[PDB]
Design a protein around this ligand. Structure first.
Ligand SMILES: CCCCCCCCCCCCCCCCCC(=O)OC[C@H](CO[C@@H]1O[C@H](CO[C@H]2O[C@H](CO)[C@H](O)[C@H](O)[C@H]2O)[C@H](O)[C@H](O)[C@H]1O)OC(=O)CCCCCCCCCCCCCCCCC
Ligand code: CLA
Ligand code: CLA
Ligand code: CLA
Ligand code: CLA
Ligand code: CLA
Ligand SMILES: CCCCCCCCCCCCCCCC(=O)O[C@H](COC(=O)CCCCCCCCCCCC)CO[C@@H]1O[C@@H](CO)[C@H](O)[C@H](O)[C@@H]1O
Ligand SMILES: CCCCCCCCCCCCCCCC(=O)O[C@H](COC(=O)CCCCCCCCCCCC)CO[C@@H]1O[C@@H](CO)[C@H](O)[C@H](O)[C@@H]1O
Ligand SMILES: CC1=C(/C=C/C(C)=C/C=C/C(C)=C/C=C/C=C(C)/C=C/C=C(C)/C=C/C2=C(C)CCCC2(C)C)C(C)(C)CCC1
Ligand SMILES: CC1=C(/C=C/C(C)=C/C=C/C(C)=C/C=C/C=C(C)/C=C/C=C(C)/C=C/C2=C(C)CCCC2(C)C)C(C)(C)CCC1
Ligand SMILES: CCCCCCCCCCCCO[C@@H]1O[C@H](CO)[C@@H](O[C@H]2O[C@H](CO)[C@@H](O)[C@H](O)[C@H]2O)[C@H](O)[C@H]1O
Ligand SMILES: CCCCCCCS[C@@H]1O[C@H](CO)[C@@H](O)[C@H](O)[C@H]1O
Ligand SMILES: [Fe+2]
Lengths: 62, 36, 23, 28, 63, 109, 37, 31, 48, 339, 494, 27
């Protein structure tokens, strides 16, 4: 193999190839953040569809 | 302010969250009972 | 008015180096 | 708790709807 | 195994839903005498979006 | 100390087994070769996998495909993988309990 | 040194050639009218 | 009437067929 | 006869408790990133 | 304790399988089918379309439909708590919100059914080719019931979940879109017709070239996921069709990949055509044929005869199928063949 | 041994030749962008932005340059049309030659990465196999994407270092590239507010930097590492195809319904501006507000600009097109020259008649003239039908207020029939049918071609996601070799 | 030129039918 300069500079980043956290890790944090993104995507869709009309938000070209 | 549309969105979000929590709570309790 | 962004570069550019090194 | 819901979620509005449809023929 | 608690009370529950005239009120279906108003040959199509509920209950006072 | 195809019924034909191991003593399956088993003849039931009953629980092998010649099934070849040593020692224990009771060679290469 | 041992060969037998030529020819017979308009 | 519509039909005929023909006469040489 | 090609996945091993070497680099990651985002909200104020 | 007990309860053996996919499938599928049954039994179409389309109004099985919402609703989701109905179930049933109920539930029930196919194949340990073949009805449902009204004016121009409403939808696409002349449609017709033709020929020749006809018929043990493919001979069928048609399969794998391949591709190309027809980007006319029709008025093909029939479908079906436009066509402007 | 549909899969096990193929694909995309910009720079007519804008000429790549700030070329014109400016280097030609030399540099790097494929960066030091650290790679790529998102939003679109973006009025009359301030509040989720786009790239850049630092420091849990099959390269391709078909459906939606990022001065009007009669209400409101201040009908209708009446024509909305009707709209009905005026129709007693307009769902529409109430007074019969309400029995004339024909009244019935046949299309315009050899058949906008192409591409990428997620999760049955066993296996015997 | 493109594609289809029936690939 070739031991280039950028191979030695960018090595610590390709070093843990299958290193996993044990157990469930941060999956409940990921689940509540996915629920927050789902509520966010819903709000944005119901603003564009105008099925959630807000004070000062006029969804048109005005 | 709170619009009727925003308040109805809150009603729909709480009823969806309820149905989604109630289905998983019933399934978790039924799975914990029939634990073989 | 107030130099908010002017001095923000210093606190935003020095932070980049921290990551780069510790990387 | 068992597959007894198959009769409680598919036979109850079926018998209700056949009662409605059998009532529907004696109109006008 | 055997199950005969209430089969035919559901049939009368379905019969009294239609025969009394409850299904027209629950599902909003108009009565066969109550399609048009007493003077006009117009169909009450909803023309608005956020006034549509008030449009339908504005039409239902013509009957 | 038995092998089942249909939970309740047992396989009374001894399979030709070819155990395999990784060099790191971590993973390795076992290619089974049932030569004319009793499940192949009649039965008319439905196999839901190879069930390997024991006294320390059970090992299920879903990879179970039968070989046919001219419309007739003649041989059922299954393969079970290990992927962990805690299932490897369970399979070697279920193998020692099977080769004690039915009679098998263990001709190690 | 090593010439990247991965270069597996490409097969395309004659019955694959016939099927692909049938696909391209009937797609051109279908879409020729719309390309000519 | 398209003048360049005939080129589209010729490029639709020729270009995948040249790929399949090169792939076949290149696989008969060493498969 | 037709061949295929699949991916060779690396071996799954659990993450060990760290050392000073990697702990101080995780600290110089987090303490770098917090003052980085603290500068970015100041640029976000200065452009609004 | 938390998760593996629920995972082992769902993947357990039962009368029906209900995996992790069943929690998405069975409420959505049950509510879509139930909303269709309670819409064709009770819910009218009078305030949206101006029609009577329920069993309560005296219709048969062919003329009931849970019709689309009104054109003034636009592409609104029509939630029960939404700003249009505002909790009123009567006004939600009258404004056409049952259509959006059935459509969104049919979408998430189809999602849950294809996840169920992936889950059962991940259990049995097979390759999930059934979930790849189910990508075609999902693409047809998404291109027709979702993408086509979302590219049009509103949800009003959509199939209205009936039998005769589906026949109106076919006549609407003939009249307003010239959808038979679309090449993507023609690939859809050819995929479906070749699939049915492949279905009949394959059934006819497995039932003919059986290994044991009846005379020394030792009934061997049959397993169901082989779909009875031990019982016939490949060599006799290849010898038959090489002499009858001049071309025949010699693989049991490529033949069945061809049976997977043909109507899924057919159905995927018609999905591409309906996605183009959402933006009215249809294949209506050949331009040089219009120039040759304008050059001399004694030129007539079957295509120029079809354009006058589409003109007739448009101008005669248009005041009743689109009553929000308020079309007043006099008898003098309506196209007649004796004019 | 590989079939034709599997020849690209030799790059699965070598991270450097995959870099070479990705670098070539990017060299191809940048070369198309430069070439498309050069071909559109050749065949462009920047001599009339009022009635011949870039959405009328079929310019597709031109508006995505002009949307972010590229106004003006080296030849000495502008998109706004001032015919002398100094834009600097960043013209249309400047960014075209920039993408051309970028395509050449990425091709040279693709050639280097294809020749020098085997490096130490792609191998582990323990085993001999090539392995990539994907859970980390997503962190460095998300940190870079969030850094460039925050940089582009907080420095470009605010105009603190850059031009702005394209901002216009509600009717597309006065619109140029101006710096726009970020909108914090609920008005930033209005899609037609340009401040929400800036506020969006500031906020999503900060959240992307935070999450990229989260992955660069936190390893994945074991449960979803084995569940989502990480360490395989194909789950990354699965979920990336999912995100990219979600994104293609979102851009087809915001192209078709319109937003602040797809304005009508660059891409053309929408079909919902015809379906609601959006510009006709503004034209009528402007005529009535002129009529209230002591004006005639000629002075009220003559003050309306030709661009606002050009948005009120059915040949400009993108739902009047064809799939194989190719090219620009100026092949479709000719180059527009001047607004004729407002056609006003009478009925020989003095009653004003109104032409019933053609809706988009009709390839041909009958000419029907109504009253204010909707009673049909006159029409044109079909071919040779008994004409009761015909233009000669009813005595229909036509008057033209404003525009080219000012105050000209036409009484002879074929000319009134021709003007009513044109007046079913909206406002009537003068069209140069020659010099492009234009047919009479309407074409569609770049709005319609963008929405068509990326709804089709998003639908096909859904099938690509199904196939790749099925190939990822079912690897051991599609191959025959379980992925969690080491391939250097021996045998035992039994 | 317009007709002969259709006749050329149809004639290549018939020639492919002849090469597919009689010059078929042996097993
Ligand atoms: C395959 C895998 C499985 C799929 C299963 C998924 C099922 C769930 C999908 C549900 C999607 C619902 C989308 C609703 C919608 O689209 O709703 C459409 C809305 C926009 O609404 C439409 O907007 C149009 C433009 O209006 C604008 O322009 C007008 C011009 O006069 C006016 O100014 C008006 O006030 C202004 O709002 C018209 O008003 C239409 O009548 C109106 O219905 O866009 C929006 O919310 C969303 C826009 C971005 C989303 C793109 C979707 C893809 C197409
Ligand atoms: C104050 C902070 C702020 C503000 C003002 C905005 C403002 C905006 N964001 Mg951004 N956002 C932010 C923070 C913010 N964002 C943060 C912190 C994140 C997380 C990183 C995001 C992530 C995000 C996403 C993922 C999206 C936005 C979008 C938007 C826009 C919504 C308007 C629109 O056109 O939607 C139009 C889009 C929708 C209404 C979403 C549709 C959702 C679909 C229906 C889901 C199902 C799709 C699936 C494939 C099936 C389709 C089936 C179909 C074929 C029938 C607007 C510019 C949207 C955008 O890009 O618009 C162009 C968008 O999709 N944002
Ligand atoms: C369990 C699967 C499931 C899913 C994913 C959905 C999803 C949906 N339902 Mg149906 N629904 C279901 C079953 C489901 N439903 C069940 C079990 C009930 C109780 C009987 C309902 C009662 C119901 C009603 C009455 C309505 C919906 C509606 C909706 C939509 C709005 C979601 C929302 O805004 O809430 C917030 C979302 C989250 C909290 C996430 C969405 C398509 C509306 C609809 O379809 O409008 C067209 C509607 O009117 N849901
Ligand atoms: C997202 C892609 C995209 C979009 C939306 C556009 C949009 C536009 N282009 Mg650009 N263009 C593109 C990519 C695109 N282009 C590419 C990749 C090139 C290089 C070839 C060009 C080169 C180009 C030129 C040279 C010109 C345009 C012009 C135009 C305009 C007219 C388009 C038209 O008539 O299409 C017509 C579209 C069709 C007829 C649809 C084609 C459908 C195909 C053939 C279907 C194939 C079916 C398939 C074979 C079936 C397989 C079945 C199998 C799986 C079983 C419009 C603004 C014209 C213009 O006005 O420029 C100023 C113009 O002259 N473009
Ligand atoms: C980022 C997107 C992306 C990427 C990187 C891949 C990559 C891969 N695919 Mg997937 N796929 C995708 C999206 C993608 N696909 C989409 C959208 C679909 C539905 C259309 C598919 C459906 C699919 C199937 C059904 C298969 C793959 C297979 C493969 C593998 C071998 C590909 C090959 O050798 O083709 C070689 C291709 C050719 C020699 C010629 C193809 C010519 C096409 C049909 C027409 C010309 C296209 C034109 C040049 C490109 C412009 C593209 C642009 C407009 C999008 C490879 C890992 C194969 C597999 O899994 O191997 C094990 C496989 O069987 N793909
Ligand atoms: C027919 C639809 C369909 C099917 C069968 C699959 C199947 C698969 N997906 Mg894909 N996916 C889909 C659509 C689908 N997907 C859509 C639309 C997206 C968003 C872009 C994704 C995004 C996605 C990602 C990012 C990944 C997958 C993966 C997978 C694989 C594992 C299962 C999984 O993660 O499910 C996902 C679960 C679902 C699709 C069910 C969603 C149910 C939602 C939450 C209901 C929401 C109700 C809603 C709130 C009601 C409001 C409606 C509103 C209009 C009012 C499998 C191949 C994974 C994989 O490839 O691993 C190798 C993977 O990483 N999916
Ligand atoms: C004018 C418009 C015309 C439109 C086209 C109409 C013709 C359609 C015919 C059917 C298409 C192919 C279906 C079988 C697919 C297949 O795969 O058949 C293959 C032969 O294909 C082929 O040779 C492709 C060429 C098809 C020639 C058709 C001649 C028809 C006879 C006309 C005269 C009758 C007296 C051979 O089988 C397979 O071939 C190989 C495929 O990988 C493998 O070896 C398989 O195991 C298997 O043997
Ligand atoms: C290497 C392999 C090559 C194989 C060739 C296969 C070609 C297949 C496509 C043929 C297109 C039509 C060609 C004949 C007419 C013509 O020539 O249209 C051209 C536009 O094409 C184009 O803009 C090509 C780009 C099309 C993008 C539109 C979206 C496509 C999304 C993909 C969806 C897939 C389902 C140019 O238009 C012409 O040029 C105009 C002047 O610039 C004039 O108006 C002319 O009258 C004429 O319209
Ligand atoms: C909508 C909605 C909902 C839902 C509901 C439901 C889900 C319901 C269900 C319902 C159902 C679930 C129903 C059922 C029905 C059934 C039926 C209706 C049946 C019928 C049958 C018949 C009629 C039969 C016939 C026959 C045949 C087939 C042949 C032979 C002869 C005879 C006659 C026997 C809710 C409230 C939640 C919410 C709101 C919305
Ligand atoms: C070497 C070099 C150079 C150069 C470079 C160049 C010059 C480049 C170019 C490049 C280019 C020039 C590129 C191009 C590209 C293109 C493309 C890439 C295209 C594609 C296309 C497509 C893909 C299409 C498809 C299709 C069709 C066919 C039609 C219809 C539609 C569709 C889509 C289907 C220089 C000197 C600077 C320097 C450095 C080095
Ligand atoms: C057993 C089957 C026997 C079938 C017999 C016919 C098979 C071969 C037919 C090939 C078609 C060639 O037919 C020939 O086409 C050219 C067009 O290129 C026609 O030419 C026609 O169109 C051209 C445009 O190109 C005009 O300039 C010309 O004025 C007009 O007559 C000829 O009038 C016709 O003779
Ligand atoms: C939805 C999936 C959420 C799993 S979450 C996970 O579940 C475990 C129990 O099984 C807990 O012990 C653990 O602490 C918790 O993080
Ligand atoms: Fe079969």
């Amino acid at each position: 193999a070739r031991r280039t300069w950028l191979g030695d500079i960018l090595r610590p980043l390709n070093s843990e190839y299958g290193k996993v956290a044990p157990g469930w890790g941060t999956t409940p944090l990921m689940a509540v953040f996915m629920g927050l993104f789902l509520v966010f995507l819903l709000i944005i869709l119901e603003i564009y569809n105008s099925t959630l009309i807000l004070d000062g938000v006029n969804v048109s070209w005005k | 302010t709170i619009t009727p549309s925003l308040k109805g969105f809150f009603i729909g979000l709480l009823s969806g969250a309820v149905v989604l929590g109630l289905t998983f709570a019933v399934l978790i309790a039924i799975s914990q009972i029939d634990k073989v | 008015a107030a130099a908010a962004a002017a001095a923000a570069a210093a606190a935003a550019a020095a932070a980049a180096a921290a990551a780069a090194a510790a990387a | 708790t068992v597959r007894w819901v198959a009769v409680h979620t598919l036979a109850v509005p079926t018998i209700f709807f056949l009662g409605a449809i059998a009532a529907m023929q004696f109109i006008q | 195994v055997i199950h005969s608690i209430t089969i035919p009370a559901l049939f009368i529950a379905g019969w009294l839903f239609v025969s009394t005239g409850l299904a027209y009120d629950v599902f909003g279906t108009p009565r066969p005498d109550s399609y048009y108003a007493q003077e006009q040959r117009s169909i009450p199509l909803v023309t608005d979006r956020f006034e549509a509920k008030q449009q339908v209950e504005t039409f239902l006072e013509q009957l | 100390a038995e092998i089942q195809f249909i939970r309740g019924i047992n396989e009374e034909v001894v399979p030709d087994v070819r155990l395999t191991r990784a060099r790191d003593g971590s993973s390795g399956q076992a290619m089974f070769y049932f030569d004319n088993p009793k499940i192949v003849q009649e039965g008319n039931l439905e196999v839901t996998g190879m069930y390997m009953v024991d006294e320390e629980g059970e090992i299920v092998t879903r990879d179970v495909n039968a070989k046919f010649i001219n419309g007739q099934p003649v041989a059922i070849e299954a393969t079970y993988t290990m992927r962990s040593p805690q299932e490897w020692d369970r399979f070697i224990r279920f193998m020692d309990r099977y080769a004690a009771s039915h009679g098998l060679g263990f001709q190690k290469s | 040194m090593e010439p990247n041992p991965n270069r597996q060969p490409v097969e395309l037998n004659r019955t694959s050639l016939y099927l692909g030529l049938l696909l391209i020819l009937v797609l051109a017979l279908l879409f020729s009218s719309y390309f000519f308009n | 009437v398209n003048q360049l519509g005939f080129i589209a039909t010729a490029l639709f005929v020729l270009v995948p067929s040249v790929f399949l023909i090169i792939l076949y006469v290149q696989t008969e040489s060493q498969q | 006869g037709r061949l295929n090609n699949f991916a060779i996945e690396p071996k799954v091993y659990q993450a060990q408790p760290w050392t000073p070497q990697q702990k101080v680099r995780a600290a110089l990651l987090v303490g770098g990133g917090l003052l980085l985002v603290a500068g970015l909200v100041a640029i976000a104020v200065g452009v609004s | 304790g938390w998760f593996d007990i629920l995972d082992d309860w769902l993947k357990r053996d039962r009368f029906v399988f209900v995996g992790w996919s069943g929690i998405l499938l069975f409420p959505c599928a049950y509510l879509a089918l139930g909303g269709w049954l309670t819409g064709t039994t009770f819910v009218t179409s009078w305030y949206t379309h101006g029609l009577a389309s329920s069993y309560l109004e005296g219709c048969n099985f062919l003329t009931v439909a849970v019709s689309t919402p009104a054109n003034s609703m636009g592409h609104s989701l029509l939630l029960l708590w939404g700003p249009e109905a505002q909790g009123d179930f009567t006004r939600w049933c009258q404004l056409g919100g049952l259509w959006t109920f059935i459509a969104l539930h049919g979408a998430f029930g189809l999602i849950g059914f294809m996840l169920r196919q992936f889950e059962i194949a991940r259990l049995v340990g097979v390759r999930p080719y059934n979930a790849i073949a189910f990508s075609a009805p999902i693409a047809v449902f998404v291109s027709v019931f979702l993408i086509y009204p979302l590219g049009q004016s509103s949800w009003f121009f959509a199939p209205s979940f009936g039998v005769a409403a589906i026949f109106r939808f076919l006549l609407f696409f003939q009249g307003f879109h010239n959808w038979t002349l679309n090449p993507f449609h023609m690939m859809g017709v050819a995929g479906v017709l070749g699939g049915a033709l492949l279905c009949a020929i394959h059934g006819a020749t497995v039932e003919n070239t059986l290994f044991q006809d009846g005379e020394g018929a030792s009934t061997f043990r049959a397993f169901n996921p082989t779909q009875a493919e031990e019982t016939y001979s490949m060599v006799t069928a290849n010898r038959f069709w090489s002499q009858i048609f001049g071309i025949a399969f010699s693989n049991k794998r490529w033949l069945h990949f061809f049976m997977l391949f043909v109507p899924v591709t057919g159905l995927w190309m018609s999905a591409i055509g309906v996605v183009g027809l959402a933006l009215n980007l249809r294949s209506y006319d050949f331009i040089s044929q219009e120039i040759r029709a304008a050059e001399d008025p004694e030129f007539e093909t079957f295509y120029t005869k079809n354009l006058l029939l589409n003109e007739g479908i448009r101008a005669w079906m248009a005041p009743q199928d689109q009553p929000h436009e308020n079309f007043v066509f006099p008898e003098e402007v309506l196209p007649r063949g004796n004019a | 041994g590989l079939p034709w549909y599997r020849v690209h899969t030799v790059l699965i096990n070598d991270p450097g030749r995959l870099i070479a193929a990705h670098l070539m694909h990017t060299a191809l995309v940048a070369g198309w962008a430069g070439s498309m910009a050069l071909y559109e720079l050749a065949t462009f007519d920047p001599s009339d932005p009022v009635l011949n804008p870039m959405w009328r000429q079929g310019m597709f790549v031109l508006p995505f340059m002009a949307r972010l700030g590229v106004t003006g070329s080296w030849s000495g014109w502008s998109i706004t049309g001032e015919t002398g400016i100094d834009p600097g280097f960043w013209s249309f030609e400047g960014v075209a030659l920039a993408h051309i030399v970028l395509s050449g540099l990425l091709f040279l790097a693709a050639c280097w990465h294809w020749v020098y494929w085997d490096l130490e960066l792609f191998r582990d030091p323990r085993t001999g196999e090539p392995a990539l650290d994907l859970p980390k790679m997503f962190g460095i790529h998300l940190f870079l994407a969030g850094l460039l998102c925050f940089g582009f939003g907080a420095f470009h679109l605010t105009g603190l270092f850059g031009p702005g973006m394209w901002v216009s009025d509600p009717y597309g009359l006065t619109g140029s590239v101006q710096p726009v301030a970020p909108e914090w509040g609920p008005d930033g989720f209005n899609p037609y507010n340009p401040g929400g786009v800036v506020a969006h790239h500031i906020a999503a850049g900060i959240v992307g930097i935070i999450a990229g630092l989260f992955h660069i420091l936190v390893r994945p849990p074991q449960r979803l590492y084995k569940a989502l099959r990480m360490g395989n390269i194909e789950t990354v391709l699965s979920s990336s195809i999912a995100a990219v078909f979600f994104a293609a459906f979102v851009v087809a939606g915001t192209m078709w319904y319109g937003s602040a990022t797809t304005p009508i001065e660059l891409f053309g009007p929408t079909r919902y501006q015809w379906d609601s009669s959006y510009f006709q209400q503004e034209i009528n409101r402007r005529v009535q507000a002129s009529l209230a201040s002591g004006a005639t009908l000629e002075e009220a209708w003559s003050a309306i600009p030709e661009k606002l009446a050009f948005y009120d024509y059915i040949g400009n909305n993108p739902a009047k097109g064809g799939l194989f009707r190719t090219g620009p709209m100026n092949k479709g009905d000719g180059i527009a020259q001047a607004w004729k005026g407002h056609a006003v129709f009478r009925n020989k007693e003095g009653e004003e008649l109104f032409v019933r307009r053609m809706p988009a769902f009709f390839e041909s529409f009958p000419v029907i003239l109504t009253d204010k109430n909707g009673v049909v007074k006159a029409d044109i019969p079909f071919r040779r039908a008994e004409s009761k309400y015909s233009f000669e029995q009813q005595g229909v004339t036509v008057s033209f207020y404003g525009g080219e024909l000012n105050g000209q009244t036409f009484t002879d019935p074929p000319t009134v029939k021709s003007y009513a046949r044109k007046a079913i299309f909206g406002e009537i315009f003068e069209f140069d049918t020659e010099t492009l050899n234009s047919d009479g058949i309407f074409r569609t906008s770049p709005r319609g071609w963008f929405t068509f192409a990326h709804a089709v591409f998003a639908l096909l990428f859904f099938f690509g996601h199904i196939w790749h997620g099925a190939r990822t999760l079912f690897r051991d049955v599609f191959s025959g070799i379980d992925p969690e066993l080491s391939p250097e296996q021996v045998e035992w015997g039994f | 030129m317009e007709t002969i493109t259709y006749v050329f594609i149809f004639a290549c289809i018939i020639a492919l039918f002849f090469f597919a029936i009689f010059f078929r690939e042996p097993p």
